[model samples]
Target: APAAVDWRARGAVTAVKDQGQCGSCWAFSAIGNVECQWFLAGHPLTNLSEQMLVSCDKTDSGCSGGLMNNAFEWIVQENNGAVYTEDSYPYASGEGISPPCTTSGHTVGATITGHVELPQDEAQIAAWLAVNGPVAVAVDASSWMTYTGGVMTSCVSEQLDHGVLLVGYNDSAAVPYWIIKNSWTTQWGEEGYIRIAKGSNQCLVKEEASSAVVG
Candidate 1:
């Protein structure tokens, strides 16, 4: 097992961004990883435009959920593929609907060479989080919509319906676990975080784990 680590406390995780009613958790998930990646790689913290992915990335739907991997691909595939901050494009889908594709007036925040899938083992996932930063991940999440806190003993699933970020872990506790950064909102779960049972692949978080890079 790796040592305990919390990238959020280390200044890597910026304020958690809200996804609102959109199923754009994948975009938020991808942004969370890159923001932390760029920060750890010696750049100032940035809030990459999740709206850019919501509006421009053709690989996935804007409001109806998306594949996290395709979000990373869209980032690396464009000439100015590197994203901007919400301050640039901003989250304009105000009514919980897909906003217009505003492809202008924004700038690059960081560059992702590409991404790779992560191993499903809890120790390896914890190790990666301890050393790298945060990972964009998918989970059954069918029941996560109602989670409030404390080990996330309920609503965990293997259905993989939503995307989240695997931020850190605590394996020493009697009920050891993985800490997840959720997109629902700061008011929804443990101050914008959730803990899944470690090692058992609760909610299939490990099954759909992956990480991206910024250069």
Candidate 2:
């Protein structure tokens, strides 16, 4: 069984850039979670290409959203489980031509064991973080288009097209914050990351969803 863990004490937060209007949310979330875990393991933050995973990983339906569990399974089961570099697989707008599958500079990471839905409890989230490096989560950020700063209290609508990486949590601020990494451009939030209101279950989007972590 997995032990209870707190993810807040791990390290710094990061945000990924979402390819314009791309439906490859699973790839972004998958790469974001794995990137942070690799960083925690002392690997330098190498811009792993999400585009490669989106285009090459046939199991996932690019531009149509995807399940994190499927992406994890593809990573572990195919390409001999390798992480691709951004240099070889540059990030491009979801439009235009997609390059062919090439594994020249791609490298594999640790094997991912399993995926699970996130519980609503903060302690439970912390425990999952402590045990698992990071988790991909969905949120109703429809009102995010006008969101600028400070804690988000009430949202106007539910925009469920996005996926983000829950890197860790922090309670030192006036309000508890769930350190989340966004796939939006760097100018969107606090340097591509945002401290969302924690403990209210606002950050946990779906009733039941799956997230992956390296075994």
Candidate 3:
């Protein structure tokens, strides 16, 4: 692995997205991983529909809360492995209310065979990320409500409640930090991103890291 890797510079990452009043972070996390994976698989970087999972994945509770793992399963098992383009399906649940699932006239932007859950180890996750791409992770973001900028060194490893994407890391930094992409729009936290201290499992980021497999 290199000293660091940022998918943004490599063009595998899409623009930062906003979940708005909706608790659809898991959808964004899951779809974000898929977008990167699809690009890494030689496809163009495209925005997939988080609303597809939010409205269609019955296994997940759209807006109220959900899991990235479950969203991946639903995408494979129930969605026929087809992730629709955001321009086609669009996001209609940003107002904190989930719209009914639709199944007509949507084009497939990307496809995933399935997903894989990485080990709960930061080093292992970093190795996997360097070889693959961004990873979907669940974390204890309870303390992010007040975060403004800079590396976040004070976070809890308690209950994981928020879903995000671990885009990259810098092992040579003064304090080695994990670069995370959030779904709160560009107006929040480092332009819709955050860097938490690595190694010590800041915010329990390594507890449930995973990624969607594109091919």
Candidate 4:
């Protein structure tokens, strides 16, 4: 495998997004992975609706909390693998409240047949990500509030309370970090992205790594 892989430069990843006061990071994580998977499958890079998962995914808890795996299952089993466009079903849970699930007047943006959970090994995960595009992951982002720029070396690995996307990795760097995409908007981290030290289980990034499978 190559020493580094950046999906953003390859036009698979999308812009940074904000979940606002809501705890809807899981939606963004899953949707972002789906968007990239769709793009890698010979489709145009498009912004999919995180609100589609936040509001319509019945298996998840909306803004309170959720899991990326469940969101993927919901998309396949409940939503028929159809992901709507962001502009058609604009996000309405920025104020920490999720509205009732509504399905109308929305354009299907991308589709996924299912999702796959990666193994709990950072090396293996990096190898898979180098060719598979971005992967959705759960992390212990409790210490992310003070992060600004550069690779993160220290973080609490107690519990995974936040969800994000793993767009790429650089094993050749001095610190060797995993380039992550956050949903806290562009004002946070490195323009809404972060680089956690790879191979050290930083923030338990390898605990729940997964990705959507597009066809």
TM-score of each: 0.94, 0.78, 0.98, 0.98
Evaluated at residue 8, the lDDT of candidate 2 is 38
Encode model 3's per-residue lDDT on 141-176: one tens digit a residue. Answer: 999998888999989779999999999999999999
Report model 1's TM-score to 2 decimal places: 0.94
Cα lDDT of model 1 by residue, 1-215, tens digit: 46566777788887877887788888888888888888998999988888888888888998887887898888888634477877887886645777677666677788778888888776777777788888888888887767777897655564878888888888787888888888776897899898888877788877878888766
Candidate 1 Cα RMSD (Å): 1.5
Provide the lDDT at 17 for model 2: 76
Cα error of candidate 1 at position 192, Å: 1.2
Kindly list the per-residue Cα lDDT of model 4 for residues 71-147, writing each as its tens digit: 99999999889999998998999998887878777899997899899999999998899878898999999999989
RMSD of 2: 3.9
Where does model 1 exceed 4 Å of error? 79-81
Residue 162, candidate 1: C-alpha displacement in angstroms: 0.5
Question: By lDDT, is 2 or 4 better?
Answer: 4
Tell me the spans in candidate 2 whose CA falls farther than 4 Å from its real position. 1-15, 94-97, 104-117, 130-132, 156-159, 203-212
Of 1 and 2, the candidate ranking higher by TM-score: 1
Rank by lDDT, highest first.
Answer: 3, 4, 1, 2
Instruction: In angstroms, give how far residue 104 of model 3 lies from its true place.
Output: 1.1
Per-candidate Cα lDDT values, in order, are 0.80, 0.64, 0.92, 0.92
